[PDB]
């Protein structure tokens, strides 16, 4: 059985994280998204895995994934439909979207046993975003309704398919279309008139990593569900630990440090002295958290350092970031309203009263920097000491005012 991961999306809604990595390499605790997917696939006896990527990202994928075929999507076309056109199979294949996290492989294991075309649907609370699944009387797929702005059903396209080579006959009939785009669900929509498409309801945890605060969402779920309290590191005297704490190998936790779990402390991390890690602190790898630094409900990616006199709450900080002493992130607005975030040029409500900042890779802040709620700082940005970052900062930009 072959599998294809469609990982050639533009990842613009996930900026600034995607300034320096594909969405497929977003960390959930210590491992990137795609590594969970490959793991699940392999667990179900699928070893011939192909990732379809943008040409821009081919190099990045080749360098990270040794036993996986990488194929580039045709340059001149876009969409989930265009991605499968580089998928080479006869006979059938498992197809999965490259930004999906889900809790287990059980459904993939089941779906590959089936002769029929099959799709997984999952119930959301915001179906109007998302492809809604309309079932017929026999509970097979009637049609997929794309972003209706009306809820016919809870049940939406989970982006996990087992499709037969049919699917290409229908991709050729497809006229595409109102987004400038070749859409897989359009082809599926034709095919389901002629062929039976089973729908299997996914029951566990599912989430697409679409927007930056979803990085916090999934990492919080993973910490609660996938790992157990352990200490493989070095914890000095007078460190207080409550609740579930994962201390990975080579992590060092100095005296005066206070930890209220659940907290994930990635390998090679250096904590303290006199740090405060609050619930849902996730330090992916090789992180430094120093004296009079408090972290709460944040994901702080590989090699990033917050060495002095800082508060980081409800935030995502990408890799190799350095915070000057006294850099502070606000997570609550003066008017205490839902924090809005600029996402692909639209002002989007995050759904969160408390939300901090989203910091791209290799950013450095000068001392005493102030960052407002919902702010995005582009990768490689440099923030002048004492600056008040009251708006988004572009990729690679110096910011003073
Ligand atoms: C998954 C996938 C998406 N796409 C395209 C179709 C759309 O233009 C866009 C939407 O996919 P989405 O899953 O909606 O998210 P995204 O990362 O791809 O896009 P965005 O910039 O909005 O964050 O990406 C591909 O070209 N190839 C692919 O393999």
CSV table of C-alpha atoms and ligand atoms in Angstrom, one decimal:
chain,number,residue,atom,x,y,z
A,1,UNK,CA,0.0,0.0,0.0
A,2,UNK,CA,1.5,3.5,-0.8
A,3,UNK,CA,0.8,6.7,1.1
A,4,UNK,CA,1.1,10.3,0.0
A,5,UNK,CA,1.3,13.3,2.3
A,6,UNK,CA,0.1,16.5,0.6
A,7,UNK,CA,2.6,18.9,2.1
A,8,UNK,CA,2.8,21.6,-0.7
A,9,UNK,CA,0.4,24.2,0.9
A,10,UNK,CA,1.6,27.7,1.1
A,11,UNK,CA,1.5,27.9,5.0
A,12,UNK,CA,0.9,31.7,4.9
A,13,UNK,CA,-1.7,31.5,7.8
A,14,UNK,CA,1.0,30.0,10.0
A,15,UNK,CA,3.5,32.8,9.5
A,16,UNK,CA,6.0,33.7,11.1
A,17,UNK,CA,6.6,30.0,11.9
A,18,UNK,CA,6.6,29.1,8.1
A,19,UNK,CA,9.2,31.8,7.3
A,20,UNK,CA,11.9,29.3,8.2
A,21,UNK,CA,10.3,25.8,8.1
A,22,UNK,CA,7.5,24.0,6.3
A,23,UNK,CA,4.3,23.5,8.3
A,24,UNK,CA,5.0,19.7,8.3
A,25,UNK,CA,8.0,20.4,10.6
A,26,UNK,CA,6.1,22.3,13.3
A,27,UNK,CA,7.0,20.6,16.6
A,28,UNK,CA,4.6,18.9,18.9
A,29,UNK,CA,6.7,18.3,22.0
A,30,UNK,CA,10.0,17.0,20.6
A,31,UNK,CA,9.0,15.7,17.1
A,32,UNK,CA,7.8,17.5,14.0
A,33,UNK,CA,4.2,17.0,12.8
A,34,UNK,CA,5.3,14.9,9.8
A,35,UNK,CA,7.1,12.5,12.1
A,36,UNK,CA,3.9,11.6,13.9
A,37,UNK,CA,2.2,11.0,10.5
A,38,UNK,CA,5.0,8.8,9.2
A,39,UNK,CA,5.0,6.9,12.6
A,40,UNK,CA,1.2,6.3,12.3
A,41,UNK,CA,1.5,5.2,8.7
A,42,UNK,CA,4.3,2.8,9.5
A,43,UNK,CA,2.4,1.5,12.5
A,44,UNK,CA,-0.3,0.5,10.0
A,45,UNK,CA,2.1,-1.3,7.6
A,46,UNK,CA,2.6,1.5,5.2
A,47,UNK,CA,6.3,2.0,4.4
A,48,UNK,CA,6.2,3.4,0.9
A,49,UNK,CA,5.5,7.0,1.9
A,50,UNK,CA,5.8,9.9,-0.5
A,51,UNK,CA,5.6,13.6,0.5
A,52,UNK,CA,4.5,16.0,-2.1
A,53,UNK,CA,6.2,19.4,-1.5
A,54,UNK,CA,6.6,22.8,-3.1
A,55,UNK,CA,9.9,23.2,-5.2
A,56,UNK,CA,11.0,25.9,-2.7
A,57,UNK,CA,10.9,23.3,0.1
A,58,UNK,CA,12.3,20.2,-1.7
A,59,UNK,CA,15.8,20.7,-0.2
A,60,UNK,CA,14.5,21.1,3.4
A,61,UNK,CA,12.4,17.9,3.2
A,62,UNK,CA,15.2,15.8,1.5
A,63,UNK,CA,17.6,16.9,4.3
A,64,UNK,CA,15.2,15.9,7.2
A,65,UNK,CA,13.6,12.7,5.9
A,66,UNK,CA,16.0,10.0,4.9
A,67,UNK,CA,13.7,7.0,4.1
A,68,UNK,CA,10.8,8.9,2.5
A,69,UNK,CA,10.3,9.8,-1.2
A,70,UNK,CA,10.0,13.5,-1.9
A,71,UNK,CA,8.3,14.7,-5.0
A,72,UNK,CA,7.7,18.3,-6.0
A,73,UNK,CA,4.2,19.6,-7.0
A,74,UNK,CA,4.1,20.9,-10.5
A,75,UNK,CA,5.1,24.6,-10.3
A,76,UNK,CA,2.4,26.0,-12.5
A,77,UNK,CA,-0.6,24.7,-10.6
A,78,UNK,CA,-2.0,24.9,-7.1
A,79,UNK,CA,-4.4,23.0,-4.8
A,80,UNK,CA,-5.0,19.7,-3.2
A,81,UNK,CA,-5.9,18.4,-6.7
A,82,UNK,CA,-2.6,19.6,-8.2
A,83,UNK,CA,-0.7,17.9,-5.4
A,84,UNK,CA,-2.1,14.4,-6.2
A,85,UNK,CA,-1.2,14.9,-9.9
A,86,UNK,CA,2.4,14.2,-8.8
A,87,UNK,CA,1.1,11.2,-6.9
A,88,UNK,CA,2.1,8.1,-8.8
A,89,UNK,CA,-0.1,5.2,-8.1
A,90,UNK,CA,-2.1,2.5,-9.7
A,91,UNK,CA,-4.4,0.3,-7.5
A,92,UNK,CA,-5.1,2.7,-4.5
A,93,UNK,CA,-3.3,4.9,-2.0
A,94,UNK,CA,-3.7,6.5,1.4
A,95,UNK,CA,-3.7,10.3,1.1
A,96,UNK,CA,-3.3,12.5,4.1
A,97,UNK,CA,-3.0,16.4,4.4
A,98,UNK,CA,0.4,17.5,5.7
A,99,UNK,CA,-0.8,19.8,8.5
A,100,UNK,CA,-3.1,17.3,10.3
A,101,UNK,CA,-2.5,16.1,13.8
A,102,UNK,CA,-4.7,13.3,15.1
A,103,UNK,CA,-4.4,11.2,18.2
A,104,UNK,CA,-3.9,7.7,16.8
A,105,UNK,CA,-3.5,5.5,13.6
A,106,UNK,CA,-6.5,3.2,14.3
A,107,UNK,CA,-8.5,4.8,11.5
A,108,UNK,CA,-5.7,4.6,8.9
A,109,UNK,CA,-5.3,0.9,9.8
A,110,UNK,CA,-9.0,0.3,9.2
A,111,UNK,CA,-9.3,2.3,6.0
A,112,UNK,CA,-6.5,0.6,4.1
A,113,UNK,CA,-8.3,-2.8,4.4
A,114,UNK,CA,-11.2,-1.5,2.3
A,115,UNK,CA,-11.7,-2.0,-1.4
A,116,UNK,CA,-13.9,1.0,-1.8
A,117,UNK,CA,-12.8,4.6,-1.9
A,118,UNK,CA,-13.0,5.8,1.7
A,119,UNK,CA,-12.8,9.2,3.5
A,120,UNK,CA,-12.6,10.1,7.2
A,121,UNK,CA,-14.9,12.8,8.5
A,122,UNK,CA,-14.6,14.4,11.9
A,123,UNK,CA,-17.1,16.6,13.8
A,124,UNK,CA,-15.9,20.2,14.5
A,125,UNK,CA,-17.6,23.1,16.1
A,126,UNK,CA,-16.7,25.5,13.3
A,127,UNK,CA,-17.7,23.5,10.1
A,128,UNK,CA,-18.1,26.6,7.9
A,129,UNK,CA,-14.5,26.7,7.6
A,130,UNK,CA,-13.8,23.2,6.3
A,131,UNK,CA,-15.4,20.8,3.8
A,132,UNK,CA,-18.7,19.6,5.1
A,133,UNK,CA,-19.6,15.9,4.4
A,134,UNK,CA,-23.1,15.4,3.1
A,135,UNK,CA,-24.1,11.7,3.5
A,136,UNK,CA,-26.7,9.8,1.5
A,137,UNK,CA,-29.4,7.5,3.1
A,138,UNK,CA,-26.9,4.7,3.2
A,139,UNK,CA,-24.3,6.8,5.1
A,140,UNK,CA,-21.9,6.9,2.1
A,141,UNK,CA,-20.7,10.2,0.7
A,142,UNK,CA,-23.2,12.3,-1.3
A,143,UNK,CA,-21.1,15.4,-1.6
A,144,UNK,CA,-18.4,17.5,0.1
A,145,UNK,CA,-19.5,21.2,0.6
A,146,UNK,CA,-16.6,23.5,0.6
A,147,UNK,CA,-16.7,26.3,3.3
A,148,UNK,CA,-20.5,26.7,3.1
A,149,UNK,CA,-21.0,29.7,5.5
A,150,UNK,CA,-24.0,27.6,6.8
A,151,UNK,CA,-23.9,24.4,8.8
A,152,UNK,CA,-25.7,21.4,7.1
A,153,UNK,CA,-23.7,19.1,9.4
A,154,UNK,CA,-21.1,18.9,12.2
A,155,UNK,CA,-19.2,16.3,10.1
A,156,UNK,CA,-16.3,17.6,7.9
A,157,UNK,CA,-13.6,16.3,5.7
A,158,UNK,CA,-10.7,15.2,7.9
A,159,UNK,CA,-8.3,15.1,5.0
A,160,UNK,CA,-7.5,11.4,5.3
A,161,UNK,CA,-8.5,9.4,2.2
A,162,UNK,CA,-8.0,6.0,0.8
A,163,UNK,CA,-8.6,6.5,-2.9
A,164,UNK,CA,-8.4,4.2,-5.9
A,165,UNK,CA,-6.7,5.2,-9.2
A,166,UNK,CA,-10.2,6.1,-10.4
A,167,UNK,CA,-9.7,9.3,-8.8
A,168,UNK,CA,-7.5,10.6,-11.7
A,169,UNK,CA,-10.2,10.0,-14.3
A,170,UNK,CA,-12.2,12.5,-12.3
A,171,UNK,CA,-9.3,14.9,-11.7
A,172,UNK,CA,-9.1,15.3,-15.5
A,173,UNK,CA,-12.9,16.2,-15.7
A,174,UNK,CA,-12.4,18.9,-13.1
A,175,UNK,CA,-12.7,22.5,-14.0
A,176,UNK,CA,-10.9,24.6,-11.5
A,177,UNK,CA,-11.9,27.4,-10.6
A,178,UNK,CA,-13.1,30.1,-8.1
A,179,UNK,CA,-9.8,30.1,-6.1
A,180,UNK,CA,-7.4,29.7,-9.1
A,181,UNK,CA,-7.0,26.2,-7.9
A,182,UNK,CA,-7.3,22.5,-8.6
A,183,UNK,CA,-9.3,21.1,-5.8
A,184,UNK,CA,-9.3,17.4,-4.8
A,185,UNK,CA,-12.7,17.5,-3.2
A,186,UNK,CA,-14.2,18.5,-6.6
A,187,UNK,CA,-12.8,15.4,-8.2
A,188,UNK,CA,-14.1,13.4,-5.2
A,189,UNK,CA,-17.4,15.0,-5.7
A,190,UNK,CA,-17.7,13.6,-9.3
A,191,UNK,CA,-16.3,10.2,-8.4
A,192,UNK,CA,-18.9,9.7,-5.6
A,193,UNK,CA,-21.7,10.0,-8.2
A,194,UNK,CA,-20.3,6.9,-10.0
A,195,UNK,CA,-18.5,5.1,-7.2
A,196,UNK,CA,-19.3,4.3,-3.6
A,197,UNK,CA,-17.3,6.5,-1.1
A,198,UNK,CA,-17.5,5.2,2.4
A,199,UNK,CA,-17.3,7.7,5.2
A,200,UNK,CA,-15.7,6.7,8.5
A,201,UNK,CA,-16.2,8.9,11.5
A,202,UNK,CA,-13.0,9.7,13.3
A,203,UNK,CA,-13.7,9.7,17.1
A,204,UNK,CA,-10.4,10.7,18.8
A,205,UNK,CA,-8.6,14.1,18.9
A,206,UNK,CA,-8.1,15.8,15.5
A,207,UNK,CA,-6.8,19.3,14.5
A,208,UNK,CA,-5.4,21.0,11.5
A,209,UNK,CA,-2.4,23.3,12.3
A,210,UNK,CA,-3.9,26.2,10.3
A,211,UNK,CA,-3.2,29.2,12.5
A,212,UNK,CA,-0.3,30.0,14.9
A,213,UNK,CA,-2.4,29.6,18.1
A,214,UNK,CA,-3.2,26.0,16.9
A,215,UNK,CA,0.4,25.2,17.6
A,216,UNK,CA,-0.3,25.8,21.3
A,217,UNK,CA,-3.6,23.8,21.0
A,218,UNK,CA,-1.9,20.6,19.7
A,219,UNK,CA,1.1,20.9,22.0
A,220,UNK,CA,-1.2,21.2,25.0
A,221,UNK,CA,-3.1,18.1,23.8
A,222,UNK,CA,0.1,16.1,23.3
A,223,UNK,CA,1.4,17.1,26.7
A,224,UNK,CA,-1.8,16.0,28.4
A,225,UNK,CA,-2.1,12.7,26.4
A,226,UNK,CA,1.1,11.4,24.9
A,227,UNK,CA,3.7,11.6,27.6
A,228,UNK,CA,4.2,10.7,31.3
A,229,UNK,CA,6.1,12.4,34.2
A,230,UNK,CA,9.8,11.5,33.9
A,231,UNK,CA,13.2,12.7,34.9
A,232,UNK,CA,16.1,11.9,32.6
A,233,UNK,CA,18.0,15.1,33.4
A,234,UNK,CA,19.8,16.7,36.3
A,235,UNK,CA,17.8,18.5,38.9
A,236,UNK,CA,19.7,20.5,41.5
A,237,UNK,CA,18.6,20.9,45.1
A,238,UNK,CA,15.8,23.3,46.0
A,239,UNK,CA,13.9,22.9,42.8
A,240,UNK,CA,10.1,22.5,43.4
A,241,UNK,CA,8.1,20.3,41.1
A,242,UNK,CA,4.4,19.9,41.2
A,243,UNK,CA,2.2,17.9,38.7
A,244,UNK,CA,3.4,16.3,35.5
A,245,UNK,CA,6.8,17.2,34.4
A,246,UNK,CA,8.8,15.7,31.6
A,247,UNK,CA,12.5,16.4,31.9
A,248,UNK,CA,14.4,15.0,28.9
A,249,UNK,CA,18.0,13.8,28.7
A,250,UNK,CA,20.8,16.3,29.3
A,251,UNK,CA,18.4,18.9,30.7
A,252,UNK,CA,19.8,20.9,33.6
A,253,UNK,CA,17.4,22.5,36.2
A,254,UNK,CA,19.2,24.8,38.7
A,255,UNK,CA,18.2,25.6,42.3
A,256,UNK,CA,15.3,28.1,43.0
A,257,UNK,CA,13.4,26.9,39.9
A,258,UNK,CA,9.7,26.4,40.5
A,259,UNK,CA,7.6,24.2,38.2
A,260,UNK,CA,3.8,23.8,38.1
A,261,UNK,CA,3.0,21.0,35.6
A,262,UNK,CA,2.1,20.0,33.0
A,263,UNK,CA,5.5,21.1,31.7
A,264,UNK,CA,7.7,19.7,28.9
A,265,UNK,CA,11.5,20.3,29.2
A,266,UNK,CA,13.2,19.3,26.0
A,267,UNK,CA,16.7,17.6,25.9
A,268,UNK,CA,19.7,19.8,26.5
A,269,UNK,CA,17.6,22.6,28.1
A,270,UNK,CA,19.1,24.8,30.8
A,271,UNK,CA,16.7,26.1,33.4
A,272,UNK,CA,17.4,28.5,36.2
A,273,UNK,CA,18.4,29.5,38.6
A,274,UNK,CA,15.2,31.0,40.0
A,275,UNK,CA,13.0,30.3,36.9
A,276,UNK,CA,9.2,29.8,37.1
A,277,UNK,CA,7.6,27.3,34.6
A,278,UNK,CA,3.9,27.4,34.7
A,279,UNK,CA,1.2,25.0,33.3
A,280,UNK,CA,1.7,24.2,29.5
A,281,UNK,CA,5.2,25.4,29.2
A,282,UNK,CA,6.6,23.4,26.3
A,283,UNK,CA,10.4,23.8,25.7
A,284,UNK,CA,11.0,21.8,22.6
A,285,UNK,CA,14.8,21.3,22.6
A,286,UNK,CA,18.0,22.9,23.9
A,287,UNK,CA,16.1,25.9,25.5
A,288,UNK,CA,17.6,28.3,28.0
A,289,UNK,CA,15.2,29.8,30.5
A,290,UNK,CA,17.1,32.0,33.0
A,291,UNK,CA,16.8,33.8,36.3
A,292,UNK,CA,13.6,35.8,36.9
A,293,UNK,CA,12.1,34.3,33.8
A,294,UNK,CA,8.5,33.0,33.9
A,295,UNK,CA,6.8,31.0,31.1
A,296,UNK,CA,3.2,30.0,30.9
A,297,UNK,CA,1.2,28.1,28.2
A,298,UNK,CA,3.8,28.7,25.5
A,299,UNK,CA,5.6,26.7,22.9
A,300,UNK,CA,9.3,27.7,22.6
A,301,UNK,CA,11.1,26.0,19.8
A,302,UNK,CA,14.6,24.5,19.3
A,303,UNK,CA,17.6,26.3,20.7
A,304,UNK,CA,15.6,29.5,21.7
A,305,UNK,CA,16.8,31.5,24.7
A,306,UNK,CA,15.0,33.6,27.3
A,307,UNK,CA,17.9,34.3,29.7
A,308,UNK,CA,16.8,37.2,32.0
A,309,UNK,CA,13.9,39.1,33.5
A,310,UNK,CA,11.2,38.1,31.1
A,311,UNK,CA,7.6,36.9,31.0
A,312,UNK,CA,6.4,34.7,28.1
A,313,UNK,CA,2.7,33.7,28.3
A,314,UNK,CA,0.3,32.2,25.7
A,315,UNK,CA,2.9,32.6,22.9
A,316,UNK,CA,4.7,30.6,20.2
A,317,UNK,CA,8.4,31.4,19.9
A,318,UNK,CA,10.2,29.7,16.9
A,319,UNK,CA,13.7,28.4,16.8
A,320,UNK,CA,17.0,30.1,17.7
A,321,UNK,CA,15.3,33.1,19.1
A,322,UNK,CA,17.1,35.3,21.7
A,323,UNK,CA,15.3,37.6,24.1
A,324,UNK,CA,17.2,40.6,25.5
A,325,UNK,CA,16.9,41.0,29.3
A,326,UNK,CA,13.6,42.5,30.2
A,327,UNK,CA,11.7,41.6,27.0
A,328,UNK,CA,8.0,41.2,27.9
A,329,UNK,CA,5.1,39.8,26.0
A,330,UNK,CA,1.5,41.1,26.8
A,331,UNK,CA,-1.2,38.4,26.6
A,332,UNK,CA,-4.2,40.6,27.6
A,333,UNK,CA,-5.3,43.8,25.8
A,334,UNK,CA,-6.1,47.1,27.7
A,335,UNK,CA,-9.8,46.7,26.8
A,336,UNK,CA,-9.7,42.9,27.6
A,337,UNK,CA,-11.3,42.0,24.3
A,338,UNK,CA,-10.6,38.9,22.2
A,339,UNK,CA,-7.1,39.2,20.7
A,340,UNK,CA,-7.2,39.6,16.9
A,341,UNK,CA,-4.3,38.5,14.7
A,342,UNK,CA,-3.5,39.5,11.2
A,343,UNK,CA,-3.7,36.3,9.2
A,344,UNK,CA,-3.1,36.5,5.4
A,345,UNK,CA,-4.1,40.2,5.4
A,346,UNK,CA,-7.4,39.6,7.4
A,347,UNK,CA,-8.0,40.7,11.0
A,348,UNK,CA,-9.0,37.3,12.6
A,349,UNK,CA,-10.3,36.7,16.1
A,350,UNK,CA,-8.2,34.1,17.8
A,351,UNK,CA,-11.1,33.0,20.1
A,352,UNK,CA,-8.8,33.8,23.0
A,353,UNK,CA,-9.0,36.5,25.6
A,354,UNK,CA,-5.4,35.6,26.6
A,355,UNK,CA,-3.0,35.4,23.7
A,356,UNK,CA,0.6,36.6,23.4
A,357,UNK,CA,2.9,36.9,20.5
A,358,UNK,CA,4.1,34.7,17.6
A,359,UNK,CA,7.9,35.1,17.1
A,360,UNK,CA,9.7,33.8,13.9
A,361,UNK,CA,13.0,32.0,13.8
A,362,UNK,CA,16.3,33.8,14.6
A,363,UNK,CA,14.6,36.9,16.0
A,364,UNK,CA,16.5,38.9,18.5
A,365,UNK,CA,15.0,41.5,20.8
A,366,UNK,CA,17.0,44.2,22.5
A,367,UNK,CA,16.7,44.7,26.2
A,368,UNK,CA,13.4,46.0,27.7
A,369,UNK,CA,11.4,45.3,24.6
A,370,UNK,CA,7.6,45.4,25.0
A,371,UNK,CA,5.4,43.2,22.7
A,372,UNK,CA,1.6,43.6,22.4
A,373,UNK,CA,-1.0,40.8,22.3
A,374,UNK,CA,-1.5,39.0,19.0
A,375,UNK,CA,1.6,40.5,17.4
A,376,UNK,CA,3.6,38.6,14.8
A,377,UNK,CA,7.3,39.1,14.5
A,378,UNK,CA,8.9,37.9,11.3
A,379,UNK,CA,11.9,35.6,11.2
A,380,UNK,CA,15.3,37.3,11.4
A,381,UNK,CA,13.7,40.5,12.8
A,382,UNK,CA,15.8,42.7,15.1
A,383,UNK,CA,14.0,44.7,17.8
A,384,UNK,CA,15.7,47.9,19.0
A,385,UNK,CA,16.1,48.1,22.8
A,386,UNK,CA,13.2,49.6,24.6
A,387,UNK,CA,10.9,49.4,21.5
A,388,UNK,CA,7.2,49.0,21.9
A,389,UNK,CA,6.2,46.4,19.2
A,390,UNK,CA,2.6,47.5,18.7
A,391,UNK,CA,2.2,46.1,15.1
A,392,UNK,CA,3.5,43.1,13.1
A,393,UNK,CA,7.1,43.2,12.1
A,394,UNK,CA,8.1,41.9,8.7
A,395,UNK,CA,10.5,39.1,7.9
A,396,UNK,CA,14.1,40.3,8.4
A,397,UNK,CA,13.1,43.7,9.6
A,398,UNK,CA,14.8,46.0,12.0
A,399,UNK,CA,12.1,47.7,14.2
A,400,UNK,CA,12.4,50.7,16.5
A,401,UNK,CA,9.0,52.4,16.2
B,1,LIG,C1,-2.1,20.6,1.0
B,1,LIG,C2,-1.8,21.4,-0.2
B,1,LIG,C3,-2.4,22.7,-0.4
B,1,LIG,N1,-2.1,23.4,-1.5
B,1,LIG,C4,-2.7,24.8,-1.6
B,1,LIG,C5,-4.1,25.0,-2.0
B,1,LIG,C6,-4.4,26.4,-1.4
B,1,LIG,O1,-3.8,27.4,-2.3
B,1,LIG,C7,-3.6,26.4,-0.1
B,1,LIG,C8,-4.6,26.1,1.0
B,1,LIG,O2,-4.3,24.8,1.8
B,1,LIG,P1,-4.8,24.8,3.3
B,1,LIG,O3,-4.8,23.3,3.9
B,1,LIG,O4,-6.2,25.4,3.4
B,1,LIG,O5,-3.7,25.6,4.2
B,1,LIG,P2,-2.3,26.1,3.5
B,1,LIG,O6,-1.0,25.9,4.2
B,1,LIG,O7,-2.1,25.3,2.2
B,1,LIG,O8,-2.7,27.5,2.9
B,1,LIG,P3,-2.5,29.0,3.6
B,1,LIG,O9,-1.5,29.8,2.8
B,1,LIG,O10,-3.8,29.6,3.5
B,1,LIG,O11,-2.0,28.8,5.1
B,1,LIG,O12,-2.5,25.6,-0.4
B,1,LIG,C9,-1.2,22.9,-2.5
B,1,LIG,O13,-0.9,23.5,-3.5
B,1,LIG,N2,-0.7,21.7,-2.4
B,1,LIG,C10,-0.9,20.9,-1.3
B,1,LIG,O14,-0.4,19.8,-1.2
